[PDB]
Design a protein around this ligand. Structure first.
Ligand SMILES: [Cl-]
Ligand SMILES: [Cl-]
Ligand SMILES: [Cl-]
Ligand SMILES: [Cl-]
Ligand SMILES: [Cl-]
Ligand SMILES: [Cl-]
Lengths: 428, 428
């Protein structure tokens, strides 16, 4: 995998130097067509993909005009081709136009990028999962963009799309964890527990600024009793491990199947290939060993929309419905109808009706047991993202309005955890 | 440009070993996606493109099914995706499916392949012309196929398509011949003359088997007086060089713009990009320095269809009409409305109406002067392809029926030459 030792400043993406540095990276990576010596940075049609939280993602597609386009924001959707100047054609004919790319810029940060790269490499070459990476640069990487778009929240409950999502996760979960570097395989410890320990310690660092001020803000931390969380994780963990239906260890989980990381491929499928195969999962930033019921339960929470992803303060929280018992069963049947022979890797697909009911009900129990974990997971993740809001609140920076209210985000998910855990049977 | 030292036997293209060797070449070339270790030769959906004469050309596209498809013949047209087996999916999801390739296998043989490669490299990197070559093997090369199809004979006279063809040739002709290795630039000797000398000497070798037998076959050679051709080339050459309107030296000519080497690109063009830009020229096997009027006159002859390309004996010779004076003028206006600044390479496109009439009429005279050359060119090329038919005739191989009647092909074009040259003014 090719590498170039150059960086971009994502905060400068609206400036010409950004296109100059992008082009330099594409040339040194020998990205085809983009490396043509006949092009210059003005040929970069640049868009920032909205809804990314941690990292900045950009579309890079071909601008045929002699003068540059202004950079704009856009959703995750195949860029429209910008107009040309008929009197000053580009130096290439259309079959040579450069293809569209995803240009990922890392923020600061789970798994490392160097380990994420090695995993992505195994996933693609041994299991046929993941994007084509043209190369990496100092703080990001460059990927092929296949024409496609993100799903909507409404599309998660479509039975055909839901069926495809269940298939793709099953395919993810059939990856041999040993090939990824986890020596213990299915007996590896769930990444959930390590995430709750690290983020609860960081959460404590963040909210100590509120406590130290006393008064109002300390009262807020006490109203939502944020210090007893460690004592509530441990009680929940002891209940889970004490369950016989907790599942057989862990699998390679995506851990973040919100609709923004689910793609509809814009492609003509082969004859007989089912409609639900045009759907795939993207963005493995959070992927790691976890119980399969955790990954699935997380997806079901994501039916409600803006579960992991926070809501902007100027928008209404979506609130789509959680899947009913039969929609979850449709999901399980689709999920379990796919078997991958571990010896040779062959995938065989069977009828959903032939899945046995004890297998379907056992998976439901797994989901039920791991589902509260997803909420405390994102709750503690929320308190960590609140570092900046807290720092402002503690300083009383005039006129500050946070882009996301992560404090409220965390309270809400913490109460989701406490409530689902109580109704599950956890003595919290 | 990557290279692998392996060969294929094009005569074995219907056999499994052919797919095995194709896959081996794609891996060693590191063709993306095709190099995936999850694929095998049964994933090669293989088609032989019809209408190739010298060399064998194959489509290589993705077969998703566990069992191989049978190899078939096909025209130059984007292969349909063959059906999959829903119970045994391919090991890749659709965004990873390998793209379609052109797999060219050379026959025996103008310019060399090693020089053709260096020229193709200059044409692509400095002028934006030509195919993306993934790599070469011992007797061929592997190219990207962009979705597209060959034109039909009927489409050559469509004013929009004709306009695009004229543009693309102008763009070809603006190439600096010095960048291609021809030190003398526009003063380089026309390749026509070297082709007529070499092929007339080979023609003589071929037809000497007919003469040596006497009787019938010698009478045939005398009926079409094939020995006085050298004396007729020289007379025609002295008339041409004596013309003041012969044009200003030579340009990089394609020399073979039959409809089979003209492509309609299947692509969504940028806004404001004119319809005729979806048309391009392919296959540079015959390209070389020649007078621009020669290349254009050759294209006009090709309006009649099956000019260069022979007709199969079981088919009727097409016989579409030659372009009228105004269709040729439409062609000249479109051709001359494009200027490429030689200093910096910028292309500017103007209105066809603003082309001056003296420039249009001067180009017509160039075409008229060089047009008989095209017929003697293909006539002598025909006598050379007749080696095998003559060898059979001279042996009286029982039941022999030639795939193409090259002897008749050559007589016909030789009389086209003699007739157009007489009506031009050549004392032949
Ligand atoms: Cl590509
Ligand atoms: Cl163009
Ligand atoms: Cl399939
Ligand atoms: Cl490609
Ligand atoms: Cl598939
Ligand atoms: Cl244009």
């Amino acid at each position: 995998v090719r590498h170039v030792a150059l960086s971009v400043d994502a905060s400068e993406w609206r400036q010409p130097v950004f296109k100059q540095k992008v082009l330099a990276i594409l040339r040194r990576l020998h990205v085809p067509r983009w490396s043509s010596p006949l092009l210059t940075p003005t040929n970069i049609h640049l868009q920032k993909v909205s809804g990314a939280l941690t990292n900045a993602v950009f579309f890079v597609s071909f601008n045929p005009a002699p003068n540059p386009t202004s950079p704009s924001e856009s959703p995750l959707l195949t860029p429209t081709i910008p107009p040309s100047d008929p009197s000053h054609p580009p130096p290439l004919t259309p079959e040579q136009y450069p293809h569209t790319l995803l240009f990922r810029v890392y923020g600061p940060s789970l798994i490392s990028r160097s380990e994420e790269l090695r995993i992505l490499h195994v996933l693609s070459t041994q299991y046929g999962i993941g994007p084509r990476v043209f190369g990496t640069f100092t703080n990001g990487r460059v990927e092929e963009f296949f024409p496609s778009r993100a799903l909507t929240a409404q599309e998660l409950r479509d039975p055909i799309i839901s069926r495809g999502i269940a298939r793709r996760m099953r395919e993810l979960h059939s990856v041999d964890l040993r090939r990824l570097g986890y020596e213990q395989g299915r007996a590896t410890e769930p990444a959930l527990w390590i995430c709750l320990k690290e983020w609860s310690e960081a959460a404590e660092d963040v909210i100590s600024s509120l406590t130290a001020l006393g008064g109002t803000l300390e009262a807020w931390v006490e109203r939502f009793s944020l210090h007893r969380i460690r004592e509530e994780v441990t009680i929940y963990r002891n209940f889970v491990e004490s369950q016989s239906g907790k599942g057989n260890g862990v699998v390679f989980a995506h851990n973040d199947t919100q609709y923004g990381n689910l793609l509809r491929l814009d492609v003509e499928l082969p004859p007989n290939t089912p409609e639900h195969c045009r759907y795939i999962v993207i963005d493995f930033e959070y992927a790691s060993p976890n119980p399969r019921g955790y990954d699935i339960a997380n997806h079901f929470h994501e039916w409600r929309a803006n579960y992991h992803h926070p809501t902007h303060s100027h928008s209404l929280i979506p609130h789509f419905p959680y899947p009913t018992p039969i929609q979850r069963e449709d999901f399980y049947r689709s999920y379990l109808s796919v078997e991958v022979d571990g010896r040779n890797g062959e995938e065989v697909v069977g009828k959903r009706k032939d899945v046995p009911a004890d297998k379907v009900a056992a998976l439901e129990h797994e989901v039920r047991i791991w589902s509260p974990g997803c909420s405390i997971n994102w709750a503690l993740w929320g308190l960590v993202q609140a570092e900046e809001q807290v720092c402002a609140l503690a300083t009383k920076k005039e006129g500050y309005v946070p882009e996301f209210d992560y404090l409220s985000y965390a309270a809400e998910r913490l109460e989701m955890f406490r409530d689902e855990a109580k109704k599950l049977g956890v003595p919290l």
